[PDB]
Amino acid sequence: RDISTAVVVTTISDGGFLDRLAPALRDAGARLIVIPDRNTGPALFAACERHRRLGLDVVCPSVAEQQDLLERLAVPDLIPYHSDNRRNVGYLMAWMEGFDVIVSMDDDNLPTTDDFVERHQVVCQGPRTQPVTASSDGWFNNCALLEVEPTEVFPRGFPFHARPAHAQARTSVCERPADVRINAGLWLGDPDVDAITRLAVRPNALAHSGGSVVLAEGTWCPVNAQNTAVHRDALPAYYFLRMGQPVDGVPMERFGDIFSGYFVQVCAQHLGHAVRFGDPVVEHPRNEHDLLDDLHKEVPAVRLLDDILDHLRDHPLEGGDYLETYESLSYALQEIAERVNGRAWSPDARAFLHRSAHLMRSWTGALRTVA
Amino acid sequence: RDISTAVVVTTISDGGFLDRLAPALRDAGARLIVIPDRNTGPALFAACERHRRLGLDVVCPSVAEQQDLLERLAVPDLIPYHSDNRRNVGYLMAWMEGFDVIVSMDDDNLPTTDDFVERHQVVCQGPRTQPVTASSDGWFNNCALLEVEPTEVFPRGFPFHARPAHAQARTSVCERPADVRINAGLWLGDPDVDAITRLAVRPNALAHSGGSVVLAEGTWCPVNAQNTAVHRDALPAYYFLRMGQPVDGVPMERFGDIFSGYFVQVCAQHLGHAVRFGDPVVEHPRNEHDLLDDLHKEVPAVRLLDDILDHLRDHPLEGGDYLETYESLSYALQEIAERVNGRAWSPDARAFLHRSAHLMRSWTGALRTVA
Amino acid sequence: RDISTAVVVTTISDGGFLDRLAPALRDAGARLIVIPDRNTGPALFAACERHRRLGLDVVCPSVAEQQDLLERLAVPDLIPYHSDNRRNVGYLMAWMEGFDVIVSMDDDNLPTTDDFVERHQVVCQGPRTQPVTASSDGWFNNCALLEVEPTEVFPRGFPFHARPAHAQARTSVCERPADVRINAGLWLGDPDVDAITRLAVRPNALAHSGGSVVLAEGTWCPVNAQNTAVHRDALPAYYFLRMGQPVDGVPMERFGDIFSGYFVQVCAQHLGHAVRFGDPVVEHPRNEHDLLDDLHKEVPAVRLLDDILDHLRDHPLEGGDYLETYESLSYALQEIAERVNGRAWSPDARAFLHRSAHLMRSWTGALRTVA
Amino acid sequence: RDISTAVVVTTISDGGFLDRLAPALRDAGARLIVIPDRNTGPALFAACERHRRLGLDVVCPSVAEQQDLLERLAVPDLIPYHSDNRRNVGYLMAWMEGFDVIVSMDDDNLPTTDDFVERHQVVCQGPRTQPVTASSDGWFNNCALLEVEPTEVFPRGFPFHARPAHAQARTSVCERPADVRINAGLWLGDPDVDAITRLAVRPNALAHSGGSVVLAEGTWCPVNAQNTAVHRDALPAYYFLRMGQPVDGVPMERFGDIFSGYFVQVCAQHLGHAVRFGDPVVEHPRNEHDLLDDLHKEVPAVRLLDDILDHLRDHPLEGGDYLETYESLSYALQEIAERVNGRAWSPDARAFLHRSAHLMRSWTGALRTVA
Ligand SMILES: C[C@H](O)[C@H]1O[C@@H](OP(=O)(O)OP(=O)(O)OC[C@H]2O[C@@H](n3cnc4c(O)nc(N)nc43)[C@H](O)[C@@H]2O)[C@@H](O)[C@@H]1O
Ligand SMILES: C[C@H](O)[C@H]1O[C@@H](OP(=O)(O)OP(=O)(O)OC[C@H]2O[C@@H](n3cnc4c(O)nc(N)nc43)[C@H](O)[C@@H]2O)[C@@H](O)[C@@H]1O
Ligand SMILES: C[C@H](O)[C@H]1O[C@@H](OP(=O)(O)OP(=O)(O)OC[C@H]2O[C@@H](n3cnc4c(O)nc(N)nc43)[C@H](O)[C@@H]2O)[C@@H](O)[C@@H]1O
Ligand SMILES: C[C@H](O)[C@H]1O[C@@H](OP(=O)(O)OP(=O)(O)OC[C@H]2O[C@@H](n3cnc4c(O)nc(N)nc43)[C@H](O)[C@@H]2O)[C@@H](O)[C@@H]1O
Ligand SMILES: [Mn+2]
Ligand SMILES: [Mn+2]
Ligand SMILES: [Mn+2]
Numbered sequence A, B, C, D: 001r002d003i004s005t006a007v008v009v010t011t012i013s014d015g016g017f018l019d020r021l022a023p024a025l026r027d028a029g030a031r032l033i034v035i036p037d038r039n040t041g042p043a044l045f046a047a048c049e050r051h052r053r054l055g056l057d058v059v060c061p062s063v064a065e066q067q068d069l070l071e072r073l074a075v076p077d078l079i080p081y082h083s084d085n086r087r088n089v090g091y092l093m094a095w096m097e098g099f100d101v102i103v104s105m106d107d108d109n110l111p112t113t114d115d116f117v118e119r120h121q122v123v124c125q126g127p128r129t130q131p132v133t134a135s136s137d138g139w140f141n142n143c144a145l146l147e148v149e150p151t152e153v154f155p156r157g158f159p160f161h162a163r164p165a166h167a168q169a170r171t172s173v174c175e176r177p178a179d180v181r182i183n184a185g186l187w188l189g190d191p192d193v194d195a196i197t198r199l200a201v202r203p204n205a206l207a208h209s210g211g212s213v214v215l216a217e218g219t220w221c222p223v224n225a226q227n228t229a230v231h232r233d234a235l236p237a238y239y240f241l242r243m244g245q246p247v248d249g250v251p252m253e254r255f256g257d258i259f260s261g262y263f264v265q266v267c268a269q270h271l272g273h274a275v276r277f278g279d280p281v282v283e284h285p286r287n288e289h290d291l292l293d294d295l296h297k298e299v300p301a302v303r304l305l306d307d308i309l310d311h312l313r314d315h316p317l318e319g320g321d322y323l324e325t326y327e328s329l330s331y332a333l334q335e336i337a338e339r340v341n342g343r344a345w346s347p348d349a350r351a352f353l354h355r356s357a358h359l360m361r362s363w364t365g366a367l368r369t370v371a
């Protein structure tokens, strides 16, 4: 096979996460692209070079190197600073260097097994008749594959209007051709849930008991960027959306990967591809957060997500590859921004979709400049 | 004994709730003060007169009669229209007419037993040595007295910072002198939880299993206005706070009774009185709500509640009765508004406490004008 | 020549303005397209038919007729209600019916001479070597053509950063080929100034003493929609921009024709056309306004206009006709929204340009559907 | 006589203004209380010590010395940092040290005559029968005492609703008993006008031609804090109001001295005192400002000022001295905050008056703690 893999992690820490992330990466020969920011301490570069001597192929381009690359591609204002949106630099760098698998992670997700990179290489097996998982309501709850206490939880970015009626949905498995291009790995410890769920029950993922599934055409599930492998063909559709836009005077945040996880998923199924959920599982000792502040950031995005996901099912896309499909998706978001109705859809909330669509085309324009 | 009781309910519905609320009220001789609003149809007045023929002492003063009463008391702008804040008119009316017990309810809380009013008369038994419930953390979860599925929940208004450590709290019962003046009855069906909790687990209260408790000095718990009896002495401290103040440009709502429940509870303990939780239990088939809109309304108040409750334990109050104690409480809130620190304490968030304090004195000034 | 002219006026009044607007329109045979709204009284239709008997060709399509037309062109959500933006319906109707001249007016601008329509027909003379007016600073003050007391004033939409240094600018006249396609007529009484000027000196236009000018390439001046004739070729670029977008949490208003006046002007000079200022002059007994409310509406737009106009001089446009040039302008506004910097350029302020650009393409798409 | 005078100036500059401010201050023996801030460089302290060697009684207490003084008076959170509100420290310091005259100035107002302090000592002559200036509309335009080009202007803080009808007002002078306690000196160069006026005509004060006047009972005029002498008895009523309160989500600024100028003027007339306008005249080479940013800061306060000034004529005050009158004024503002009606009076706009009133009593509570 001879598959190449690059791990993308943006961080502002000192680099102590390398002591638990490097072993699983250097044993597989994968590259770790660390994306620092302006407010990143100089201890990260010393930690990257400390693990560079141990055999880990890790790079840490300074903010000057990142800006010189983005300026050559006519996108100097696309990716802002003091934000985790800079992981798009790692997405771009890994895509230019010809890596087969781009693994998006955070500085607090730690692989639990030695075959972490090997399990993420499932996005390179190509098409094959395989068992696919379908749901009668068109949604799949990936947290059902985990043992979560005290009660059952839904993942972050899961539509709320479909949660009460999801328990009585019919889940079936059929032998169908599928082409896995996105593999969202599960997480133990603190699972990826929204601030509403974490403030209510404080979930704790005990074990992985559900195995792995491949969702069929029409069944969706939110995909995050903390333990997700994306094939290089689907990478153009995996642009981490820019946050900070006010909805009803409240700037949204924490949903950059919620849109990207859904955008690359809608684009994949249009091109005959599928999304996988399950292994490899990582430990998630989540960074210390103000949970009420996470709620303050997530509310502006939650009030709009359910309407966005519903209109995406009514808008058939066009395109032959992920570049054409993603740009067709951006124009579809602009038509949705004017057809959708509701109390939360103020003029600035509709404008959020229009500016995001322009930033999506600015992202694809930079990739076409490289190729 | 010969105890009098008046039930206060404000509503914009057609009055169909009277069919299930009247039987327990007319059999006890209690008065039902229905407070309509400008957005209330003429079906409520026809429903009040229909049950008045059957023997229910129900009154429904028109908005013209309400405004004439408030204008004669030099408070024409205290209580706004198109808001459930108009229940303060019922609090005022029941207090002017000399009722011993004022029961605050909503148009969807329906009693389950014939002795609903009799159980609410516990706020007129006077002081007596009785078992009181104390907690090491100073908080009591009244929802623990209920059988809630699928998991344990906290009531609306419970501080979030004290929820994780509450499982390790020590609950003790001792024979201490206490005087019950507020009786917060429990609710079956849809329990009184915040939008964060209802959006995450959709709680369902199955039965009342914990009995009744009387909190000791230093143990607090939120008290709503949907099934709560208040002695006429503690009625001046039960002013339903006016909502609509913006916090970071977001107007707060749904927490008018959260502050009143805590304010009358802080004033009661300063005067040697206590709060009771438990019976009578009512059925709560809650009206249809947009839960994402309930969340958008409650988040501004949730960001500030934990800090307000913490600083209220630092301010010992003054006063001999509830009128003087509540006014002393308003001045203490204005000192807290400038001492408190935090990200959510913008200039408009601090100004919310100053304007609320003025409305609290404008309220007590109206009661003093009556007496 | 045999030139056709249609006057477009949107109003919510009773139609009393027809008693002073009809004589100058029926004597020239021009058509008056009145655009009512949902909040327009039924007295307007009775006034349109009252003047229809006197010979005035006046039409007043109901909101049902307007929505049926906009729905056939796949633009049902483009033009909102309860807004003067509905004048775009008259722009569209006059453009479909093949009128040579489209005159945009308001219900308070009254022609002072009998040859009002004849003077507005100057946008049909075609190219000819004529004296053109150029300025060293690239700006022209059309109010200098009027006698204004107590002091000199600038028109609404004039950039503030160029006002102090405009007095020492060199104004020259040269014999140059020009093709007049937009003719902005002057106004007596209350001149078209921003709320800042009207609150400061309360201008009063006494007489028209400067005559008429035709601005050369590179010299700009704001063009309003209250007394402006536009040739049918330039009509696609005269889309009245949609207002109501919050900038720093403040919705902008009163600048819909400021952008359209500048957009059709930038598009005209790219295609070798020019803008004329001067006759015909109209009386402007302005409707009663809250001047502090006008300031509250205009401030969000004023804070951004100077930066927008500067970047438009740095962005060369493309296109062979007004449809291609206007759409190229919309994409230029999206590039400006990301390159511009400043304190007033918040994420929602930049999003204002992105949503406006989409509405500009939705406007051109509806015109291409007709043709 | 033997009158003492202390000049209060807060600044973040390097101290170069002392070269033109010291000569008139050191020749009169007056004290200069310079109030630095956290964003003040070390060049100011070196400039204060440089002029202290030349005989200027100038003091510059560090932010640590200021905070220790405010903490000992139980007001550590009253005066914020990074704001010109810190001049209240100078007001407090000059009042504690027993100075008869407190002159409030800015770091860009420079005296033009040698008797600058001597002319400001008019607030210590006591009551005497003197010619007083009265107006039929109750307003006086102090800018009419100046020679302003290109047109007549109104001072910053003048109500806009009274500006048109002010030209028909009757100005009379009568010999009436008056007691001058506030002396608002005039300014040449850049006059103290609002951003609306400066953005429209760019006024330039050429000379002082109107002399000096003493307004009668019922005639008001805004009084700034850049060239104003205040007797030590009226100093408690001269609290510089704290800015930053949002009105419709827009924080107000630049009007801290507008309220203080009116508040000390309303309190003075209740106690039988008057306000004087005219000499001494200073040069005002105003610091560089973004006028569009000055407008964005002043609009929120302008929308409310006319209504506040109107209701202040409906509330007669109580109190024997300025401490009691200013506190009575704070309670009257809270009654106005609920009586006033208008589009601009959102819940946060009314709450601005309630929080400001609490800060006014927190101010006077600090003065009472000293005395
Ligand atoms: C932001 C959202 O919250 C997202 O967090 C995700 O997981 P999360 O909620 O668990 O947060 P967490 O894993 O702790 O950090 C997430 C990673 O962003 C990095 N980071 C933080 N501040 C940064 C800054 O200024 N610059 C740069 N360049 N990077 C920064 C940190 O180093 C972490 O590696 C999703 O939920 C959601 O899309
Ligand atoms: C609103 C908050 O949310 C409060 O609700 C409580 O319970 P709740 O969350 O279950 O809502 P609910 O019981 O349905 O209505 C509560 C009652 O207010 C009445 N009402 C509704 N709109 C009204 C209007 O315009 N005018 C007047 N005069 N009254 C109105 C309804 O008729 C109900 O009787 C607490 O949570 C919280 O303090
Ligand atoms: C709005 C800005 O203010 C614009 O006014 C212009 O002139 P202006 O400032 O002098 O205002 P004015 O001439 O009085 O009215 C302007 C005309 O809009 C009509 N109108 C008003 N409310 C309406 C509504 O809800 N629906 C519909 N369909 N039409 C409405 C009125 O009937 C007038 O005919 C420019 O300044 C600026 O672009
Ligand atoms: C601000 C308003 O606008 C006020 O200006 C007045 O006059 P003005 O409009 O002409 O401004 P200006 O005279 O330049 O500065 C006024 C003085 O505040 C000082 N200053 C500036 N930033 C400061 C900061 O962070 N901390 C501290 N401690 N001080 C600061 C400067 O050094 C000047 O001495 C009134 O209009 C209005 O009440
Ligand atoms: Mn994490
Ligand atoms: Mn309810
Ligand atoms: Mn007009």
Ligand SMILES: [Mn+2]
Pocket (backbone or CB within 6 Å): D106, D108, D109, D226, D284, D286, D287
């Ligand atoms: Mn100044």
